[PDB]
From a paper:
The large (L) protein of LASV is a multi-domain molecular machine that binds the conserved 3′ and 5′ ends (the ‘promoter’) of each of the two viral RNA (vRNA) genome segments (denoted L and S) and plays a central role in the viral life cycle, which is entirely cytoplasmic. The L protein contains an RNA-dependent RNA polymerase (RdRp) activity and catalyses both viral transcription and genome replication. Transcription is initiated using a capped primer derived from host mRNA by a yet to be elucidated ‘cap-snatching’ mechanism involving the intrinsic endonuclease (EN) of the L protein and possibly its cap-binding domain (CBD).
Two further structures were obtained from a sample in which the L protein was incubated with a truncated promoter (5′ nts 10–19, 3′ nts 1–19), which lacks nucleotides 0–9 of the 5′ end. One 3D class from this sample, obtained by focussed refinement on the promoter-bound region, (DISTAL-PROMOTER, 3.89 Å resolution), closely resembles the full promoter (PRE-INITIATION) structure, but additionally reveals a new position of the EN, without inhibitory peptide bound. In the MID-LINK and DISTAL-PROMOTER structures, the EN has flipped by ~160° around a hinge between G195-G199. The EN active site faces away from the rest of the polymerase and is exposed to the solvent, free of the inhibitory peptide. Instead, inhibitory peptide residues 1087–1099, as well as PB2-like segments 1759–1770 (lid), 1852–1860 and 1894–1896 (mid), 2077–2081 and 2089–2091 (link) pack against the back of the EN, stabilising it in its new location. Similarly, the α-bundle of MACV apo-L (with its different topology) superposes with the pendant domain in LASV L, showing that these flexible and linked domains must rearrange from the apo-state observed in MACV L. Finally, the position of the pendant domain in the LASV PRE-INITIATION structure is incompatible, due to significant steric overlap, with the location of the inhibited EN in the APO-ENDO or 3END-ENDO structures. This important observation provides a plausible rationale for full promoter binding (as opposed to just the 3′ end binding in the secondary site) inducing a flip of the EN to the alternative uninhibited location observed in the MID-LINK and DISTAL-PROMOTER structures (see above).
Numbering used by the authors: 1 to 309, 318 to 405, 410 to 811, 825 to 886, 896 to 925, 939 to 1002, 1013 to 1040, 1055 to 1559, ...
Write the structure that this text describes.
RNA sequence: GCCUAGGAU
RNA sequence: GGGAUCCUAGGC
């Protein structure tokens, strides 16, 4: 700790500015050794610096020797009788007036004003005495709120502050030095404030340690470049390059890379694109539609022809009851559970049959028994026979099988009921019959014969003949297929609620167990199409791809397939949507005369496409549709890339895709049809929207492993050609790695072009020195700016999951073990063999025997091994055997298992474990267990000393120890759990599966806590958690800080098409990157053109675009490939080290540049990790290929790259190359680079030709808007235009920026960020928004999905979607919700919306509309009543007799009280009876990824106790339904769409408060919602609704639009917050963004409306819309800075009268009403400043802190007197704004509270000095104002003022 | 492979 | 990716 004081003493000796006035305390601090002495001297030094800086900035000389005002005056030559001893911190005299000063620091507005008022009273108590010598005193006060002075570098400042606080943090010393008051004041003074600068300059508190490796890098980055070239010079180089390029090109030495377009060739190649197996020339629609319906199982089932055709049985009740019993894990699943449970349902069906001849619940020999299981009957009889036989033998080794069977039945049923009756309710709802069990049944069982069909499931494919129906019977134009598909998809989705059961029959014995299988069956689901039923059958549960089978009763097993439950979602219940989609889509192109005939064919084709998408959803069918957009984009263009068509040829596997290809090719050939020309825009829209029919599938991933391998290959494969791949770089970098790094850094800049015997070689990384020098020089010469930059010099730019590492020692592991991994792989392989491999290969194959040997090796139960030796593989096993043998030979803190030591009946424990496995501890149920059990458990735990001290404290155990004695057992049980932290292999597998990892993961905040808790300032700030904290390093090498290097990790982010990469960091990597990110973004913010962060740029982009397509100017829409993995931080550093910013200052520039150099140098050395499963799978491939068990495909380069390093020893773990930039990490710097480079390139092209170009960017995309000249030239000299484009390609390639083959050039479209535009018409996107809105449901409260879908629909409607679609979607969602039977309240969603209900409505306005529609003739007067009420209130007549009198008050008859307080008749007596059931009127509903799983979770959660009691309990929803159904005065009511709302009588409104506690009346909610919305929106929403019939039909062309705008002081809000709720205000706005502790507000206008609005609220963009003017008719319409400147003026004027204050840069700015350099133009309120205009400009709006002199109006300072400005005994000028009644009211309120003579004198003086200027007072009153202000004594004050 | 009793899912 | 039984003891 001594080193701390040492180094800080060194700093304060060095960096302290030379001034002898600091020397004294300097000495006093540089000599002490006692801690307390050092703290005192340091704090005194800091306060001295503060007061010095203050007295300098104000203009008062520093009282150094600490004189006294008596002495201060008497040594100045005046007489002073006697004073009280006061010590000033500075003073000054001017003639007969005096100026004092006093300053301090306080960081809390509560403890701020105290010092202010104390100093003011201490000064006035001396002014009163001073007044009698004819001398004026002016008591200045200053209130700085930070110790950040100006004579001291700030990093030294806080480096001193924190070490002082630490030395002060001696516990014993702090205690035995002072009390808690001053301790608390001091600790919050060294608060480690975030300061005013960036947060990286703190680097200067650490060593350099930059010995040798850091030099040559900078040299190379600075060696060849020449960043000084003049402006004119660059023209020469540019011209020479252009000339040599054109010359060497025209002679045909380089390619052309660009082709002109022709529709013929494009169509021809698009047709013959896949021409190797689509043996077709032309296409007939008829044969197509014919062979479609007979394609594949689902299709052949849909369009088929089937189905030309309540009992309260005794098979359901039993089943429901047994299901419920099974749910709770009561019974021990042991040697034979489910068999008896099957026998019981067998007897149930037997009994039920012979009474009413039921025909249900049966397929051949099958019956859905318990958990959707479909058992046979024969094997049941056999196993029952065998069971009773061996049981009789056990009785032998008397009774008959009947007797023992009924005995078991009686025993199990009795145990069942006995367990149930502990807590569970009984037969009361379970209406069962104990006659089912006959006194003899086993015989009756053995005499049951049913005949029928047999069930089968066929795995392998078949032929198209086992289908016993007639294929083509349905028709396209009808909508049966969609409903069949909906039903089937729902039957699929529902296949997840099954729980993993325990099978009964292995069902097969032999390798045919994957061939057609039928002995028994397994689980099954039920669904109805129109008439009869159908069973859907599967075998194993979960959510993994498997087989299925569709069984029926009249025939067996219509088909079978290979689907997967998820990914089939977005079709359920949505049938009348898709049809409407297709219809409105067709509706566009239906007027093309040249297409009149075969139009119906188009219809069929469109429909067919959609059904195909829905029937066979698969990965590689998405990209085919997506890529289509680029083709159509190319069609309308002019020039396209040379190598385009070879992109749309990815990969196809099975047939269906080729069917889709043929269909779409036919449709394109028919739509395009070169001999038709009429409607181009509509066909454009049609095809384009057809291309977006890809989102309909899903966004998820098909697999995991082969999804990770792809991304890993994408990562690695391009970093190998360049020839630089390091491996396992240790934290201490050896020399060879540094050497290779230098060599590669040199190689990177070795690019060349157009001057060589080889010419340019595209598609290879690197930058050439010529172009880089040209760029840098042309940038430094200011040849890339405009007036918005030359006039504004660039100010200094300095003013999810996270990985947790492992640890074995000081070091950190970085390499997996070899032999451990070998053992792991072997084990896994043995598992794979044991599960499936053993049932596929023959026993006389060598591979089978090998696997057998390796399995009996690894677990417990040579001529073959000799042949193995002859098969080469000899030594591999010889070593591996002993290796893994030795690996396998090598292998009281309170916990959860201890429960088994207390609770003997385990069933309770299983209950508890389930409940915890569902809900948190905080919301555990009270009634899961018997009430006595809690007390008995608490007793049995408090007895046993062990667990007692393990959870009780004898001296969080405190809260439990205390509560147990007080006998609140439930809180005790919950607490003991909150401590419990519940929230044949011969070795241990899990330990191995954990040892051979390296990195683990954690959430965002779980680590932020564990960080912030281990430091002083518990306010999370950037530069506090890595610089000044425990566990941080001291110095740093050229590689990284002494903690280590910058790790990372890999994963994938999924989208449509392919998947992008995802880097993940640790805490430190994030913390350090964030600084560079913020820096570069702040820097880019000054320059115009970027569009990644801003908003008001993107709209300018859109406006420029829309403007471009009116004159046919040639747009150029680009893109960029491999942007991520082909950028390098070396390039950023190199272009930075040559950047020269503002040239006025000298050093801080290079300081920042060096800091950034160090940061980038750290970043260049990252150590990317490699995932685990990738390594496991590749090792598996290796160990296979070694023996070559199953020869796979020919290995790519990655497998060899691995195996090479693998069969030498080392297993590759980390790779640290140079070539790759982070993918998504270093965004802002990449955008900066792209912007600068693009501007330079456009500059060059301007230099060559005679035109201009405008561009933009987000991260890699771009546009280019050719000027008029470059457009109009293109039509005469195509050669020159093409060569310009080519030279652009070349140049832009030289700077390491490529162009993807999908860019285009055109005159008819313009693309940006996927937002297309055309002339005249506009292009919507229907399919995208529809497919988005179809699946956006998760497992939240059903009151949130409402606003979710409402937001989605509001966003969509703005883009030309027609509203009918939206209503259909809303109805679909409501039906999906009703499927779970959640009783729909009134306001859940408004399924009636219109076109006015979005463009001018909120989320709730539509609620008001549905209510208005529901129950009229009541609101028809409530509206007028609220209208009168609001009209009266808006002018503030009562303004309080409603909020604090009615709103909070009990809504009992308050309405009638309003109606009598306003004079309108109250409602009827049969009005209050309306209400609406609200679940969760006490506490929100308790709750217990993907989408399907989310939906099944939401479907499950409802049932299981979604109800909280009065205090805390649990119930159901059916319960409350019954308990309402009891009371015979409660009448429900429904609407057409379905909206429950009730009628309950006021006569029993009380007297039965049991269930009625939930209900809530409707008109109350209507009133309050209406008032709130009206206050918020425009008050026009309280007219009278109406429907119009004033229109005749007009021929509505399908494309016609009409843009629209929606129909709509923060300082005052903040004022009211600080005036009403101070505690909430200080802790939520000041630390967020504010510093206004030293600010006054005692003179500010007030508003009553806003005040009461805020009191209620605390008590209780969307630019344009684009719609069709063919809809705008059928609707309804309803019937109805200068301020701030004048506020500051009146504030100053009012303060001028209360006292006298000096006018300086700190007095004025200290107020609140002031334009503190906000968004204000040059001249806005400068006319309303009088004598203060120039000061704001010349002084305030430049950063100049000085006092006011006489030269500031056109050497004594100025004094603000009453109204007019005064110098020493003379007036120069004045100013006086206008006053109002309310301002005077607030004035006389706040001033005339305690004293009187002050108000009288002030008013008299104001009247006097305002009369002598002859202004007029006739505009206001006096007497009534006084009365309204002083309600009891206005007479005497009237007399006083008027006298 | 079976019966009884229990434990774990 | 596509069929769930494991341990200990007692009588066998
Ligand atoms: Zn029946």
């Amino acid at each position: 700790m001594e080193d701390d004081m040492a180094c800080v003493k060194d700093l304060v000796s060095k960096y302290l500015a030379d001034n002898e006035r600091l020397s004294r305390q300097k000495l006093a601090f540089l000599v002490q050794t006692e801690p307390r002495m050092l703290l005192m001297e340091g704090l005194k030094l800091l306060s001295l610096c503060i007061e010095i800086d203050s007295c300098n900035a104000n203009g008062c000389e520093h009282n150094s020797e600490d004189k006294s005002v008596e002495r201060i005056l008497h040594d100045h030559g005046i007489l002073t009788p006697s004073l009280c001893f006061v010590v000033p911190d500075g003073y000054k005299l001017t003639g007969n007036v005096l100026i004092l000063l006093e300053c301090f620091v306080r960081s809390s507005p509560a403890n701020f004003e105290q010092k202010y008022i104390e100093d003011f009273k201490k000064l006035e108590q001396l002014k009163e005495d001073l007044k009698s010598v004819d001398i004026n005193l002016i008591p200045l006060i200053d209130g700085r709120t930070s110790f950040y002075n100006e004579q001291i570098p700030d990093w030294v400042n806080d480096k001193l502050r924190d070490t002082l606080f630490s030395l002060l943090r001696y516990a014993q010393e702090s205690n035995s030095l002072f009390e808690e008051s001053e301790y608390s004041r001091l600790c919050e003074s060294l608060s480690m404030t975030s300061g005013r600068l960036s947060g990286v300059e703190s680097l200067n508190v650490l060593l350099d340690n930059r010995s040798s490796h850091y030099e040559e890098i900078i040299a190379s980055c600075h060696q060849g470049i020449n960043n000084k070239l003049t402006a004119h010079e660059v023209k020469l180089q540019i011209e020479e390059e252009y000339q040599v390029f054109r010359n060497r090109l025209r002679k045909g030495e380089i390619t052309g890379q660009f082709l002109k377009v022709d529709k013929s060739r494009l169509l021809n190649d698009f047709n013959n694109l896949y021409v190797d197996e689509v043996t077709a020339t032309k296409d007939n629609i008829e044969h197509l539609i014919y062979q479609f319906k007979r394609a594949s199982p689902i299709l052949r089932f849909l369009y088929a022809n089937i189905g030309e055709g309540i009992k309260e049985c005794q098979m359901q009740y039993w089943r429901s009851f047994l299901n419920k019993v099974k749910s709770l894990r009561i019974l021990n699943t042991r040697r034979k559970l489910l068999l008896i449970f099957d026998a019981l349902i067998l007897l149930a069906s037997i009994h039920d049959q012979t009474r009413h001849k039921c025909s249900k619940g049966w397929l051949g020999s099958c019956f859905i028994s318990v958990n959707d299981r479909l058992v046979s009957l024969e094997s049941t009889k056999r196993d029952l026979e065998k069971w009773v036989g061996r049981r009789q033998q056990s009785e032998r080794s008397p009774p008959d099988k009947n007797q023992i069977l009924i005995s078991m039945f009686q025993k199990t049923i009795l145990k069942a009921t006995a367990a149930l009756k502990d807590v569970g309710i009984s037969v009361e709802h379970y209406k069962i019959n104990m006659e089912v069990i006959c006194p003899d049944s086993y015989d009756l069982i053995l005499n049951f014969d049913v005949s029928g069909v047999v069930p089968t499931i066929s795995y392998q494919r078949t032929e198209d003949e086992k289908f016993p129906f007639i294929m083509g019977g349905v028709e396209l134009l009808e909508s049966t297929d969609l409903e069949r598909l909906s039903s089937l998809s729902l039957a699929l989705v529902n296949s997840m609620k099954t729980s993993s059961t325990v099978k009964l029959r292995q069902n097969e014995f032999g390798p045919a167990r994957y061939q057609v299988v039928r002995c028994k069956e397994a689980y099954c689901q039920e669904f109805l199409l129109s008439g009869a039923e159908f069973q859907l059958i599967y075998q194993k549960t979960g959510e993994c791809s498997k087989c299925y089978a569709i069984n029926d009763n009249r025939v067996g097993e219509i088909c079978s397939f290979y689907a997967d439950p998820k990914r089939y979602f977005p079709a359920i219940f949505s049938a009348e949507v898709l049809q409407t989609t297709v219809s409105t889509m067709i509706s566009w192109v239906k007027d093309c005369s040249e297409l009149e005939e075969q139009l119906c064919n188009i219809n069929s084709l469109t429909k067919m496409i959609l059904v195909l998408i829905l029937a066979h959803p698969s990965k590689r069918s998405q990209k085919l549709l997506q890529n289509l957009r680029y083709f159509i984009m190319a069609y309308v263009s002019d020039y396209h890339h040379k190598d385009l068509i070879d992109k749309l040829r990815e990969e196809l596997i099975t047939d269906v895709e080729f069917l889709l290809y043929r269909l779409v090719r036919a449709l394109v050939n028919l739509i395009l049809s070169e001999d038709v020309k009429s409607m181009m825009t509509n066909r454009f829209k049609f095809i384009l929207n057809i291309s977006y029919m890809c989102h309909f599938i899903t966004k998820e991933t098909p697999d995991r492993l082969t999804d990770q391998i792809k991304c890993f290959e994408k990562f690695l494969e391009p970093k190998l050609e360049f020839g630089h791949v390091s491996i396992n770089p240790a934290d201490v970098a050896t020399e060879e790695e540094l050497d290779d790094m230098v060599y590669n850094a040199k190689k990177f800049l070795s690019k060349e072009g157009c001057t060589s015997i080889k010419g340019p070689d595209y598609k290879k990384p690197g930058v050439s020195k010529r172009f880089l020098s040209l760029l840098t020089s042309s940038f430094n010469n200011g040849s890339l700016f405009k007036e918005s930059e030359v006039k504004r010099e660039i100010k200094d730019p300095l003013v999810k999951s996270v990985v947790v590492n492992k640890y074995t020692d000081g070091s950190r592991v970085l390499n997996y073990d070899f032999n451990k991994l070998t053992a792991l792989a072997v084990s896994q392989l043995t598992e794979v063999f044991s599960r499936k491999g053993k049932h596929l290969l023959n026993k006389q194959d060598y591979d089978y025997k090998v696997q057998q040997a390796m399995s009996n090796l690894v677990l417990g139960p040579a001529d073959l091994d000799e042949i193995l030796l002859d098969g080469g593989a000899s030594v591999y096993f010889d070593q591996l055997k002993e290796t893994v043998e030795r690996i396998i030979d090598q292998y009281d803190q309170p916990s959860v298992n201890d429960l088994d030591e207390v609770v003997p009946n385990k069933f309770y424990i299983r209950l508890i474990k389930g409940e915890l496995s569902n809900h948190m501890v905080e919301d555990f149920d009270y009634d899961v267990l018997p009430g006595n059990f809690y007390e008995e458990f608490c007793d049995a735990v408090y007895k046993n000393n062990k667990l007692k001290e393990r959870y009780f404290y004898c001296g969080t155990k405190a809260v439990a120890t205390r509560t147990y004695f007080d006998q609140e057992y439930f809180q005790c049980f919950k607490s003991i759990l909150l401590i419990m932290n519940a929230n044949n292999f011969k070795f241990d597998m899990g330990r191995l599966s954990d040892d051979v990892r390296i990195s683990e993961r954690e959430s965002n905040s779980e680590a932020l806590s564990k960080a912030l808790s281990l430091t002083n300032c518990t306010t999370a700030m950037l530069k506090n958690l890595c610089f000044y904290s425990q566990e941080s390093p001291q110095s740093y090498s050229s590689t990284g800080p002494d903690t280590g290097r910058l790790k990372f990790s890999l994963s994938y982010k999924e989208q449509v098409g392919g998947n992008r990469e995802l880097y993940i960091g640790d805490l430190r990597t994030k913390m350090f990157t964030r600084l560079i990110e913020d820096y570069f973004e702040a820097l880019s913010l000054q320059l115009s053109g970027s569009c990644l962060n801003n908003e008001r740029e993107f709209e300018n982009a859109i406006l420029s675009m829309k403007l471009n397509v009116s004159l046919a100017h040639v747009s150029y829409s680009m893109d960029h490939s491999k942007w991520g993995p082909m950028m390098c931080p070396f390039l950023f550093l190199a272009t930075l080290q040559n950047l020269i910013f503002l040239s006025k200052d000298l050093q801080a520039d290079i300081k920042g540049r060096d800091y950034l150099s160090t940061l980038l140098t750290w970043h260049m050395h990252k150590m990317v990790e490699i995932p685990f499963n990738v390594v496991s799978a590749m090792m598996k491939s290796f160990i296979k290929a070694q023996l070559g068990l199953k020869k796979k495909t020919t290995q790519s380069i990655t497998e060899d790259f691995f195996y090479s390093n693998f069969q030498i020893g080392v297993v590759p773990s980390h790779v640290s190359s140079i070539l790759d930039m982070g993918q998504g990490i270093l965004h802002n710097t990449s955008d900066f680079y792209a912007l600068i480079s693009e501007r330079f390139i456009n500059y060059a092209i301007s230099c060559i030709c005679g035109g201009t170009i405008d561009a933009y960017t987000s991260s890699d995309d771009q546009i280019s808007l050719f000027d008029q000249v470059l457009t109009e030239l293109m039509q005469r000299d195509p050669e020159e235009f093409k060569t310009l484009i080519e030279f652009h390609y070349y140049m832009s390639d030289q700077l390491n920026k490529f162009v993807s083959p999908k860019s285009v050039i055109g005159r008819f479209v313009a693309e940006f960020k996927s937002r297309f535009y055309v002339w005249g018409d506009e292009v919507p996107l229907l399919t995208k928004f529809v497919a988005a809105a179809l699946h956006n449901i998760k497992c939240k409260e059903p009151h949130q999905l409402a606003e979710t879908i409402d937001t989605i629909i509001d966003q969509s409607v703005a883009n030309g979607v027609p509203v009918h679609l939206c209503n259909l979607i809303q109805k679909r969602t409501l039906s999906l919700l009703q499927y779970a039977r959640y009783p729909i309240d009134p306001f859940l969603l408004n399924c009636e919306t219109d076109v006015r209900d979005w463009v001018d409505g909120n989320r709730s306005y539509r609620i008001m509309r549905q209510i208005e529609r529901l129950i009229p003739d009541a609101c028809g007067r409530i509206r007028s009543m609220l209208r009168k009420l609001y009209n009266k209130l808006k002018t503030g007549q009562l303004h309080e007799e409603f909020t604090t009198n009615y709103l909070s008050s009990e809504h009992l008859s308050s309405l009638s009280n309003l109606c009598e307080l306003l004079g309108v008749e109250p409602p009827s007596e049969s009005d209050l009876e309306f209400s609406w059931l609200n679940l969760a009127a006490h506490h929100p509903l308790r709750m217990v990824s993907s989408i399907a799983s989310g939906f099944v979770g939401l479907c499950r959660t409802l049932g299981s106790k979604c109800v909280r009691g009065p205090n805390k309990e649990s119930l159901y929803i059916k319960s409350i339904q019954s308990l309402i159904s009891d009371i015979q005065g409660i009448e429900p009511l429904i609407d057409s769409h379905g909206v429950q709302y009730w009628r309950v009588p006021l006569n029993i409104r009380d007297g039965n408060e049991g269930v009625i506690s939930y209900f809530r009346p409707l008109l109350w909610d209507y009133m309050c919602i209406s008032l709130s919305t009206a206050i918020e929106l425009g008050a026009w929403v309280l007219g009278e609704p109406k429907k119009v019939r004033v229109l005749e039909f007009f021929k509505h062309n399908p494309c016609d639009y009409f843009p629209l705008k929606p129909a709509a002081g923060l300082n005052h809000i903040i004022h009211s917050l600080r005036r009403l709720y101070p505690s909430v205000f200080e802790k939520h706005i000041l630390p967020f963004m504010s510093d206004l502790a030293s600010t006054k507000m005692k003179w500010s206008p007030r508003i009553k409306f806003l005040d009461l609005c805020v009191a209620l609220d605390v008590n209780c963009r969307e630019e344009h819309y684009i719609v069709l003017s063919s809809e705008l008719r059928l609707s309804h319409t309803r019937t109805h800075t200068s301020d701030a400147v004048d506020n500051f003026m009146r504030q100053i004027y009012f303060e001028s009268y209360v006292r006298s204050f000096v006018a300086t840069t700190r007095t004025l700015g200290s107020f609140t009403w002031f334009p503190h350099k906000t968004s204000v133009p040059e001249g806005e309120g400068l006319q309303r400043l009088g004598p203060f205009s120039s000061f704001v400009e010349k002084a305030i709006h430049k950063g100049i802190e000085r006092p006011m002199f006489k030269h500031d109006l056109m050497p004594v300072p100025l004094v603000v007197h009453r109204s007019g400005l005064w110098e020493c005994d003379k007036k120069l000028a004045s100013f006086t704004p206008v006053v109002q009644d309310q301002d005077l009211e607030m004035f006389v309120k706040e001033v005339g509270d305690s004293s009187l003579d002050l108000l009288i004198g002030a008013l008299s003086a104001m009247i006097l000095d305002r009369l002598k200027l002859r202004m007029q007072w006739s505009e206001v009153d006096i007497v009534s104002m006084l009365k309204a202000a002083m309600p009891s004594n206005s007479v005497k004050v009237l007399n006083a003022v008027l006298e």
